[PDB]
Amino acid sequence: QANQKRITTPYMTKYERARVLGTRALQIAMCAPVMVELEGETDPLLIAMKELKARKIPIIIRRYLPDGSYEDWGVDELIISD
Amino acid sequence: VQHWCRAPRPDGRLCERQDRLKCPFHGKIVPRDDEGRPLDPEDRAREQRRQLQKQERYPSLTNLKAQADTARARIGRKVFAKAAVRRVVAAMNRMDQKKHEKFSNQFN
Amino acid sequence: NTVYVFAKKDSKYAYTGECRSCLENSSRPTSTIWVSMLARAIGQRIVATLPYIKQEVPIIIVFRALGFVSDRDILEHIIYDFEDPEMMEMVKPSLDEAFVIQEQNVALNFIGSRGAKPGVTKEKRIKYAKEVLQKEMLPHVGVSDFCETKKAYFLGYMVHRLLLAALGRRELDDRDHYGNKRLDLAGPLLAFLFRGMFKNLLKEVRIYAQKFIDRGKDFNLELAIKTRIISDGLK
Amino acid sequence: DDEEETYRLWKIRKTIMQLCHDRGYLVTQDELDQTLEEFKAQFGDKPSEGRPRRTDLTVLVAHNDDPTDQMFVFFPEEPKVGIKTIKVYCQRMQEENITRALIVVQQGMTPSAKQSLVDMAPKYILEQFLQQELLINITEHELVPEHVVMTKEEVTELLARYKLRENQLPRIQAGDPVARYFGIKRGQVVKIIRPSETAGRYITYRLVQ
Amino acid sequence: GKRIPFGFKHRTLPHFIKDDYGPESRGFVENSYLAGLTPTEFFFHAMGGREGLIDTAVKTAETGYIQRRLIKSMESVMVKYDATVRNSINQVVQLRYGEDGLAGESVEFQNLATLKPSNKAFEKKFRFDYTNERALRRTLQEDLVKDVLSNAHIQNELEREFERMREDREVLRVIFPTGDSKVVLPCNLLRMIWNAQKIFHINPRLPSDLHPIKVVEGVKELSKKLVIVNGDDPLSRQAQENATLLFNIHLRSTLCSRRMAEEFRLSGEAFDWLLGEIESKFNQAIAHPGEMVGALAA
Amino acid sequence: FLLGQSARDAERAKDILCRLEHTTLRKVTANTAIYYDPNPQSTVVAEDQEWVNVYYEMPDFDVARISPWLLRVELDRKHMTDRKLTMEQIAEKINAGFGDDLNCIFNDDNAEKLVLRIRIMNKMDDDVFLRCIESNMLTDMTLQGIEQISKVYMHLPQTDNKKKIIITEDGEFKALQEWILETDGVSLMRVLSEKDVDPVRTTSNDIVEIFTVLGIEAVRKALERELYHVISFDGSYVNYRHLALLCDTMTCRGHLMAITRHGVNRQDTGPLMKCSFEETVDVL
Ligand SMILES: [Zn+2]
Ligand SMILES: [Zn+2]
């Protein structure tokens, strides 16, 4: 799809949010570098939550449309609600 | 049932039949005077038109069609049809359904 | 041994009065007999389903075959009072259905022609029908011969009850009434087993006796009686 | 016996006039509402004796934008219309140079005749209707929503909007009561507008099959 | 559903005479559970309880079958990133989820204000009055009265808002032939209005600061922010019209320019907060794509 | 739903009722008998001889053609009136069905006992034959109404859900307390096309018959309605999204789809899902 027009919703759905946190936590657990500052956190999911709240998670979401095309959004572009 | 057929019979008498709607022998009942003429001239004209229309309208061997072409054969064909007997059986079974309904208070 | 008139709502028979007959002694299982009334010329026609006869049979035939040949003698046995017209015109159609068979031997042919095997001599056919109507049909009334007036009165009773059920003068039997039921305690159950297993003992003793007698030699009981049959069957 | 008959024939004329008006043709409002007594005056009130005769009733209407697009409405008389009368009406329609027509049988249509209708379709389009299924104009019922047949340009705009194929739309059988009333044929898309209680109004589309 | 049946021969039990239709004979328990039950009432009560037990023990199989069958029927329908609803085969089932494309856990019962009121009462209640200076002094501050009473642009805007509400009343009367105002819609506007009053200490006893044209315009831009069917070509903006017809009717009426000056008495800050609130609470009601609405429905 | 003033007064509604309800001859016959009458001038029965000789003297219908065999049928009054009906129409129908071979005649609707005679006039003998005619006549000679409509009911609906709701001149709603007919069989095709049967509101609770008579969007709305009534009968509540999704899944292909292995397992879902649902072996 033309990446100029983007028909998809500009909000991170609940499913995309759950899976972003899960992936990013697993990647922190595998010693990947962390993007924000940790006070004393050692839980991968608490740190994943800190990153997402600060919008520093380096993931792109590829949204497949029913025609066949797709859209590549960064998680920082999406309005996270919860 | 007040109005009478009152049509002119061939014997010169007027019909005394007390039918609500139609005379079996004079068709639709219309209101007639003491001498049988319909009160409505248009009704009289229609009756006259209907009467005029009604007035206007191997040989030595036996033919099997004679039996086939008779009232009794026709009626037999109609009644003794699979559809007809099926409807008869259905109605009689519904009669049976009522005499099944003849046990209200008890277990039946 | 008691007559039960039921009706199945989704069915091809207006009624059916069964009689799960059984001689009081545990001699053979119960042999049921039905006496039905065909659903809705289209007059109601009564028929009976005898045991070991391959087809339903008009009842008036089964009365002929019992020696009550004239029509009036039969309506003496079915209709205990000749004043009620309605039951008389209830019985009329069935008394027409089999006007053709008018004598005992003819009706016995009619019955026995259904039965064991098609191509059989005549005398065997009449013996077959007679054996049925005596031994197999309504045993509890009697298996001995010359029990035919008893059998005719009882079958007339069955038909009387059916005709009342159809005219509505009595109520269809309830199945869940316990007056109609019998509890079947250890005595009867265990005697059902013993009867079967003893029969099998007797057959096996026949086999054993037969092989040794065929070989021209005598045979010992104590080897004929495979005692384990009853022991292990009950156990 | 007869008043019922003239009433029936008038009602059928009325429903056919509405039918042709909604099918897009030109029908003057007088025919959309012609009261029963007016029909009795114009055609007679005793058809049973033959005043009017059903053959007196035929309609010929002309499409709004195109004057050459014309359609007949034939009322045969025999309840079980044979093939022969179909041949007659086909010849009628052929010689007067129109390509669309309708039939209003009463009791049915001989199987040979419906076969003739089906097989000869690409030449001319003509459909069967019964008496009984025209004494009521169904598209007034409370259940049946407001259908609107779309033109081909609108269909391509549709499929370019939603980027979907025709086979991805919900279907409506070509023998539906409302496809038959509207005279839509396979490949056409009929748009429905029905009021929804959660959104107010809702527009859905159905491809014909 | 019938009194006790005659299981003996025209008797419910052998303690009664035949053809006894009294209340006792057919099973009327004239005792409390604290006074006891006499033996026949005990038996009849047992029969009733048995009906209940068998019912509980024989309904379950069929209902379980129905649950299984519906699940397998609908399971793979789900909301897509196009915002459509589709099955596994990728054919359309619903162009928008539920004809408005909202989730079900965020709507709540509301009440259309303009459906029922009589023509005269609707006139009296929803028509802004810009002629009577008395009321305008009581409700609106001085400057607002001056502007509202002199200008003609303003007066025409107010008359146009009343025209739109009249059109909406007829549309509703078409949708809801029976006049039931209970409808289920995303944002609770009466409660947001009450909240806003409390958050800003809106005294209902002093003339208000809000300019009625601010109400008119702010509501218009709001209605433009509440986008369900995105797009600009005619077909998308017709679809967007339809998807939110009823929420916009309800919003436009409750959030009126006369009600907002005689009922709620909001202030300018309060109105701005309220508009932001309605926008957010609407935008969080929309179905999340990837939602399995088939299994949810089944 | 009645259309005109029939909605208000009871009598017009009852007229329409009797004009829908099927009334075979059995329902309006008291008792019948197959006599043997060779001479019409001298009937066996006495009480009928008056109107007998009133009819048979005038020779519109031949006496020579007539067979000696007779049917005589008794009609009972209160039944005979309940359908607002007279011997003229029954005579008419019997003429219509069998044509002219079956002579019919009938007295006037004034005698205490309502009587008429069907003695024929032109394998199985006439004794059997007239029994066959009697059975056929009583079973399937339709005098009124529409088959497969057994009873027909009437009432003023208390619940506003069925009342007639209208918008008065002031724009206020007002329900009307008016006449309805609830039947017991179903033939919507005919019942719509009748005088003073409102063809805009009369519906049925039989979705297949609607789907045949009104199409697929009609049945979608109807299916919605029946489900909503079933679910919310007990005061329960279920959102609308779910009910709409079920209805739309179930009509999405243009024909009615059943939620069964016949309808679910016959669409184009691909083999593996089909084998999961039911009937695995055949599918694979
Ligand atoms: Zn006369
Ligand atoms: Zn006459």
Coordinates of C-alpha atoms and ligand atoms in Angstrom, one line a residue, chain B residues 5 23-26, ligand 2:
Chain B
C5 CA -87.9 -15.9 -5.9
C23 CA -83.0 -19.4 -6.6
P24 CA -81.7 -22.8 -7.6
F25 CA -84.1 -22.7 -10.6
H26 CA -83.9 -19.0 -11.5
Ligands
ZN2 ZN -86.2 -21.0 -10.1

